[PDB]
Design a protein around this ligand. Sequence first.
Ligand SMILES: CC(=O)N[C@@H]1[C@@H](O)[C@H](O)[C@@H](CO)O[C@H]1O
Ligand SMILES: CC(=O)N[C@@H]1[C@@H](O)[C@H](O)[C@@H](CO)O[C@H]1O
Length: 178
Amino acid sequence: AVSFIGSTENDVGPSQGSYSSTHAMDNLPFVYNTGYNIGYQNANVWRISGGFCVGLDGKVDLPVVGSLDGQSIYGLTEEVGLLIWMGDTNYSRGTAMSGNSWENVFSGWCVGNYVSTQGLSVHVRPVILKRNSSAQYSVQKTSIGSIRMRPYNGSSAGSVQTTVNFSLNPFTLNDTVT
Ligand SMILES: CC(=O)N[C@@H]1[C@@H](O)[C@H](O)[C@@H](CO)O[C@H]1O
Ligand SMILES: CC(=O)N[C@@H]1[C@@H](O)[C@H](O)[C@@H](CO)O[C@H]1O
């Protein structure tokens, strides 16, 4: 069996956080080293039991404005982009996102004759896109995409909520250019 125990709408990163970085103007696109700080994580989004098998698919709705090392650079503003990862609970298990389609972000696992849970995580990193002198960039609260649980091996979601959404909290980038 499966049931939904998380939240439908989830914020990514601290609200109106400020991030500073320094980069050479010739080093673009530039990814801010924010670690897993601009993210969301919850080990308990679905409760599963009795042989239920489940994985996760992720979808980013932001426009693809570029590509970096095999993953999409999603657009926020003309000057700021975003790299995105979605996956199982541990941030380290995040899957690099590309495109705007539902992608497998967690191969899945099957619970046995007991009850457990299925979680998820999302983290992103800001990207400076255009050459410019030192400047401050502001990013508005913006919807990013979603993550859906995906039953397999004959398991079924039935009427259970399968999808949750993620909204990027506003932030400011204090960009120093050398
Ligand atoms: C409470 C807890 O840790 N539950 C985790 C869940 O978050 C994760 O999605 C799943 C698959 O790795 O393993 C469970 O044990
Ligand atoms: C278009 C679409 O829904 N893509 C799904 C993908 O999410 C899923 O991970 C994969 C196998 O699990 O099967 C594809 O059909």
